[PDB]
Amino acid sequence: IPQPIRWAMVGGGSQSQIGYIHRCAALRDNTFVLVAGAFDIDPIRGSAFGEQLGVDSERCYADYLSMFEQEARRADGIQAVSIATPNGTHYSITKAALEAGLHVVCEKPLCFTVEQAENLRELSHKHNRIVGVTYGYAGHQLIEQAREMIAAGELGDVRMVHMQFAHGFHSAGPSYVLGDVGTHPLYLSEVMLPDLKIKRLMCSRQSFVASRAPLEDNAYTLMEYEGGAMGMVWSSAVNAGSMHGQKIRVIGSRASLEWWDERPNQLSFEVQGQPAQILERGMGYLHPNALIDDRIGGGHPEGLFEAWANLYYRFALAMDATDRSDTQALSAVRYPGIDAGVEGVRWVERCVLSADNDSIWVAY
Amino acid sequence: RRIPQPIRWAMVGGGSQSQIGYIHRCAALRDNTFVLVAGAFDIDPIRGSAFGEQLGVDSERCYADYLSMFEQEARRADGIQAVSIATPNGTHYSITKAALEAGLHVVCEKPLCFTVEQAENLRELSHKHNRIVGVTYGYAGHQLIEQAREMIAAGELGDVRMVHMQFAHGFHSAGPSYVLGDVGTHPLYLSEVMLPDLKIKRLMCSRQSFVASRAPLEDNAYTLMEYEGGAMGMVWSSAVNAGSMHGQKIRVIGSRASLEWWDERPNQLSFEVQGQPAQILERGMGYLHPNALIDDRIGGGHPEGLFEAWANLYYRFALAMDATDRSDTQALSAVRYPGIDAGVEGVRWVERCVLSADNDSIWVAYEGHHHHHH
Amino acid sequence: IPQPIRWAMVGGGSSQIGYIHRCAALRDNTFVLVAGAFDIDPIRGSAFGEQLGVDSERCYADYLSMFEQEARRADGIQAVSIATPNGTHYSITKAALEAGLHVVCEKPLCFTVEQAENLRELSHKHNRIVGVTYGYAGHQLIEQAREMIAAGELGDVRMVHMQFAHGFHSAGPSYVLGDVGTHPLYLSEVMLPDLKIKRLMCSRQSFVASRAPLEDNAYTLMEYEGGAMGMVWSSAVNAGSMHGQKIRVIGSRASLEWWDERPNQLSFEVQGQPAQILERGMGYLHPNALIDDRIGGGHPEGLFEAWANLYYRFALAMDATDRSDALSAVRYPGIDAGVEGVRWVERCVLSADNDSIWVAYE
Amino acid sequence: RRIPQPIRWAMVGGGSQSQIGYIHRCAALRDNTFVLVAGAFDIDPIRGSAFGEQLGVDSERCYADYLSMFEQEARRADGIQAVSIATPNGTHYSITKAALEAGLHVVCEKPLCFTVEQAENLRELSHKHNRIVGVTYGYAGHQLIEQAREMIAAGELGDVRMVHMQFAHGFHSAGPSYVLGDVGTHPLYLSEVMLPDLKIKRLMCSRQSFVASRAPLEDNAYTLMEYEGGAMGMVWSSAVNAGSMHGQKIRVIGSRASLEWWDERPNQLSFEVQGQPAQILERGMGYLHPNALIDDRIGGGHPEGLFEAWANLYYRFALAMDATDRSDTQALSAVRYPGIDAGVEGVRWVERCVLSADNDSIWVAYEGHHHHHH
Numbered sequence A: 001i002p003q004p005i006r007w008a009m010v011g012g013g014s015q016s017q018i019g020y021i022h023r024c025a026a027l028r029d030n031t032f033v034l035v036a037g038a039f040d041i042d043p044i045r046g047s048a049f050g051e052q053l054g055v056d057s058e059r060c061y062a063d064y065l066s067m068f069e070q071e072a073r074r075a076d077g078i079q080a081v082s083i084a085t086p087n088g089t090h091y092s093i094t095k096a097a098l099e100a101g102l103h104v105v106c107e108k109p110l111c112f113t114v115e116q117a118e119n120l121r122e123l124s125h126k127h128n129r130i131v132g133v134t135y136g137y138a139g140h141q142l143i144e145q146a147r148e149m150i151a152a153g154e155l156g157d158v159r160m161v162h163m164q165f166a167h168g169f170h171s172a173g174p175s176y177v178l179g180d181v182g183t184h185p186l187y188l189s190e191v192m193l194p195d196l197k198i199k200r201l202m203c204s205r206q207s208f209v210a211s212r213a214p215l216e217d218n219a220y221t222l223m224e225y226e227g228g229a230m231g232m233v234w235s236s237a238v239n240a241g242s243m244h245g246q247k248i249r250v251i252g253s254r255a256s257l258e259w260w261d262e263r264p265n266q267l268s269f270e271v272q273g274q275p276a277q278i279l280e281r282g283m284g285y286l287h288p289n290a291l292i293d294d295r296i297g298g299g300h301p302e303g304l305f306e307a308w309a310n311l312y313y314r315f316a317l318a319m320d321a322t323d324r325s326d327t328q329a330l331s332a333v334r335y336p337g338i339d340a341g342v343e344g345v346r347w348v349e350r351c352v353l354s355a356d357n358d359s360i361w362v363a364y
Numbered sequence B, D: 001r002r003i004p005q006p007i008r009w010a011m012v013g014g015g016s017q018s019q020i021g022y023i024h025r026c027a028a029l030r031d032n033t034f035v036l037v038a039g040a041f042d043i044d045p046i047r048g049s050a051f052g053e054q055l056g057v058d059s060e061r062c063y064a065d066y067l068s069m070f071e072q073e074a075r076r077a078d079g080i081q082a083v084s085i086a087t088p089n090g091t092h093y094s095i096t097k098a099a100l101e102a103g104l105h106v107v108c109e110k111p112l113c114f115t116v117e118q119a120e121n122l123r124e125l126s127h128k129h130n131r132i133v134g135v136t137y138g139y140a141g142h143q144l145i146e147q148a149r150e151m152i153a154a155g156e157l158g159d160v161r162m163v164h165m166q167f168a169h170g171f172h173s174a175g176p177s178y179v180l181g182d183v184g185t186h187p188l189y190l191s192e193v194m195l196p197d198l199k200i201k202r203l204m205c206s207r208q209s210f211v212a213s214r215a216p217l218e219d220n221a222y223t224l225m226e227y228e229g230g231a232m233g234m235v236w237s238s239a240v241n242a243g244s245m246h247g248q249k250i251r252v253i254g255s256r257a258s259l260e261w262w263d264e265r266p267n268q269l270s271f272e273v274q275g276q277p278a279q280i281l282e283r284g285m286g287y288l289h290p291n292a293l294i295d296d297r298i299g300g301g302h303p304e305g306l307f308e309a310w311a312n313l314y315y316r317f318a319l320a321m322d323a324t325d326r327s328d329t330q331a332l333s334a335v336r337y338p339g340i341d342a343g344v345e346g347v348r349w350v351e352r353c354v355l356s357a358d359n360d361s362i363w364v365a366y367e368g369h370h371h372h373h374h
Numbered sequence C: 001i002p003q004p005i006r007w008a009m010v011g012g013g014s015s016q017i018g019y020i021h022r023c024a025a026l027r028d029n030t031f032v033l034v035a036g037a038f039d040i041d042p043i044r045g046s047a048f049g050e051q052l053g054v055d056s057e058r059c060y061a062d063y064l065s066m067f068e069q070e071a072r073r074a075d076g077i078q079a080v081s082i083a084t085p086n087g088t089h090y091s092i093t094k095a096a097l098e099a100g101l102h103v104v105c106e107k108p109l110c111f112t113v114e115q116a117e118n119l120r121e122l123s124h125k126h127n128r129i130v131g132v133t134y135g136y137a138g139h140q141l142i143e144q145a146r147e148m149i150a151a152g153e154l155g156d157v158r159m160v161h162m163q164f165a166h167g168f169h170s171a172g173p174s175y176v177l178g179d180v181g182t183h184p185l186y187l188s189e190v191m192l193p194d195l196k197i198k199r200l201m202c203s204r205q206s207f208v209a210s211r212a213p214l215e216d217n218a219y220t221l222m223e224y225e226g227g228a229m230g231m232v233w234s235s236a237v238n239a240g241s242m243h244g245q246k247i248r249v250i251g252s253r254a255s256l257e258w259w260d261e262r263p264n265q266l267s268f269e270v271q272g273q274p275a276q277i278l279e280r281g282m283g284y285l286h287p288n289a290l291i292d293d294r295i296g297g298g299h300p301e302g303l304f305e306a307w308a309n310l311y312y313r314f315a316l317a318m319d320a321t322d323r324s325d326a327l328s329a330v331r332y333p334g335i336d337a338g339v340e341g342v343r344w345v346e347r348c349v350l351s352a353d354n355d356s357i358w359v360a361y362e
């Protein structure tokens, strides 16, 4: 991309951790350039924030509607917008952006219902604009390594996919942890095993902090994949003592792979009957696709900020290919798009249906 | 001191070809808690006698079968007082029954038997003949398991919310069940030790035979449980967890903190208070509870292993036998060991999981009768 | 700092070193890149600089030309970072200072103590700062260690064991001593500022023979005033090691240990108590260790964050020096740190070249 | 099979008040390699007799002192054949000497003695009376130490460049030395097993007494060594490494790869080939060398501990004794155990480090005479 994509944010204002990483990622390597935004419901502190960031005073709109309409009149108007507002606003804001002919990057989750998600998807195709979803963990290079090893048959036939995102920060929309954290490792499995398809699943959710009912702060999701493989997802915000605990273990007939988000730069490779191995980010034995995004030599620890930059970069590549109508270039870019968004919403929906019905199996 | 005279002991099976006879002997004979004076070591008379004589066992006490041993030993004044059964799982029920009927304390290699009805029969006989029936859930012999029990009882974890268990190795990546009873019940007993008051209300199980030829016996299973009171429990049993050397772990999650133990690192115990720095407790340290230090056989820092745990277990079996022989109920209750009750529950747990699994993972009441329609 | 500092880069063109420098300086718009001498090849330099959005007339052919022409601009650079070969650090830093520009020089300030003394002379004379890239000190937990040690949580310090031994090369006056040994040495400086080296000895080897007389491995034993002992293992031939930079501070009451490959955790081991692991971003950390958090605990930050934090401190020192006032409340690897880094290497080489005899530190 | 009849054994010390007597007995009596038939267990005859009797030792063979035992036992047809000395370090020399002169094989708790001259005397006596002198560098009993030896000999590490050793615990944070001989020599013997052909050319040592009252005995020390051939070696000995439970580690660094072992995790061995994924080898796996599998007492995955290592050690002492009794030199050379030579070298290393440390860390020749001026 010869030039930075004219960008803007909705939300992600003062003291927003989420907004900060979005900006770091998007502006990394000047892939995007923040030229406008609706940073706060509070108009005064919205412009005060936008200006410290160097955003022109007249482009620190009071809301997303005014921003979209006014920007449409500028030859230098925004081309894409990132949404970091509350979950219940995601559907309406993403809908507007698309109708405005803008590329979108929406913070998880896309929306609350499958219907809404399918509506947004029809619009993205109608307006020919991408809708990326922030499954930022997929930006870590080793996730690519796993994908390549599995496709190359290094694990043999896949038998199980054990996932979990269980932290304890809350030991003291249709769901809470299922949508807030469960979907992250679920998307990682999508990247690692793109051909695996869910046939049916059951879920058991609890509200250990009672006042949270009906929203769950803990959940178990058991899945049956077409072909015989099994899947398990443990979602939690009450796993006391856990700093994050997002892990995915893929088990095959020949070996297993295991990745942990708190140790992003190492990937466990366990061949049955052989010594366990630890693969390191940036090493020459890695598949080429797992090396392209390295920003520093192996041994030097990269982090989540790098992963998000890698993710935002792919978003940029997708938008660009979509704009130049370069069918070939778009097919070569893998990113969390509208389909991943739809699936995230559907998985949660199926899980809630099962859980509300005493954990019955439900077709996917 | 407490076992002044070594308990006259015998073994059924565990001969030359046995893969478990060694740990049983090392554990039982340690500190001379038991003394091997007889046995029915082999289905092959000559090989059994050869083996037995190599152990210093009276040639005339190397019986051809468990029945002849029980019958003849019962006529001797210095006849065996206890017997350890290490024969194939299918024989555990009948041998344990014969031993009990013969007035012998029993130590049975898990499982105790295959059905709950058989299990209840052994329990009935055990009470009738006033003889114990220890079951070999030997991982419970590790000191830190007691530490966890003490910590949980002291409210260190606040209210218990989840008990996550697993015993998933991958050696087989290439009765009524396989992994559920072979490995699943080990961590299950560990939870019993750490949380004696927790009662299972109902559970569901999903089991698979990844190596198809094994069906209907499962080489992988997931068990989700609901404890009375709201807590949840999960058990992952597997012999196809490729790359895993054992993988037996248990994590107890409470409202205030969690604790986790892994059998491959038996001398450490993770203690994670939410909002505080994670902690690692070490076997043999002064900050441990006395009940978690009494079994130490060497100073902290030096690693102890499964053999020590098994010796610790057999020692409790001996204490239980002595208290029972003394008709001391209160004393007996002070001995924390996997006895007839744990044996029954281990069989029940497998039976309920199998019932759930055979019925597409529907919820089944842990106790009581489950019905399709009623 | 209301306005970004007008910044330039010498070298670090089409260079991961240049990359992390830029990522760090430009983050949160602490600095703004307006000029540079990116390459020996003007064509490649201009192309590079232009890709970065730098005016073509400000993509200078050499550092002197840049310093000369920029002095004539109201929007001229105020600071310059050097990422050229270690052999050019001295002369370029000297030129920068005489030009009245703040400087950020890559790891080795220079080769000799004389040179280091001269640069310090100039920094004071032109009242400009000279930061050195001991970036690992940017990690928050290093601050945590410093505070814990100062509050006496380790009791009396007895030993300081450091190492930076990787194996990438298993197949100036030194090599690893200056390239990797000085990194954990600076970490100890931040953790134990009051510690003073009395004397030390060093043993160095050239396992890959052709590297002689430069060492690819070295052991440095030190005696601190007060009785504490210090050990430094520098290596590029520790086969199998991805980096292996670690520091363990041992006190009479407890120890703490940090490893650069797991920057977000700090081991705290109180004798007779359960070992503890401190996590970046947690509420039990000292306030000073939390100020630089850019994201919640549990999310792994990395070396890029540490460098960002380092560059912010450089900016703060430059500002305070400019507004002339504040400079005392900002800790950072400056000229003194640079000088000491040079002296430690010089003392180590002297000892090693003389069969590991003890040598007074100063 | 190779020890048809249990070796008539005895202990000097290791009584009820000893904290090392238990591991010696467990190791020696395991598999009936040895049989305890006599002892000089306590300087207090009454307590020694009581103790000994509790072990099945005839009251008449519970001697009041090692001298009496050696003299009386030598006059018995069923007299002891070997003796383990577990008394204070200062007595090792004289007791070992007396045992050897009394025609007894010896197993001495380290160190063998305090001076090289004494160590050479014991070596001379050992050859004269043709009796072995094993030294308890028990950590070498762990299987993975043999694996490392095999890997190094097979060239897995390429050319050895560095040998980094340490044994630094913090239990004491609050003869001629303390930690050098007490813990320093353990990993040193581990390196001897892994790198038998490596020869020390010269070394320097810096030692400190952080708890001043201990001086001149050190509670911390650093030893830097130059091996013949160019490789370097480092040993950190410490009793004041606050927070460390044991901390015994050895990392061997070669031109191609490195390997590392930690006594607190004895069942794993790190294998790091430069440029390749780090590897972790596990005790009991089929990819190990048979010499590293032969001592397995249970399947991999189950953790073995220091007691197994010690039993493995004692078994080798037994094999060495038998080979010596058969006068089979070639057979004796196949038995890899810490014998008199390892004993002498353990004493020499300490003596050289002390000489250097006492002289402000000057380089001292490992072999030969060191001089201020010459």
Ligand SMILES: [Mg+2]
Residues within 6 Å of the ligand: B117, B118, B120, B121
């Ligand atoms: Mg019945």
Ligand SMILES: [Mg+2]
Residues within 6 Å of the ligand: B207, B208
């Ligand atoms: Mg099925």
Ligand SMILES: [Mg+2]
Residues within 6 Å of the ligand: D117, D118, D120, D121
């Ligand atoms: Mg002599």
Ligand SMILES: [Mg+2]
Residues within 6 Å of the ligand: D207, D208
């Ligand atoms: Mg001194």
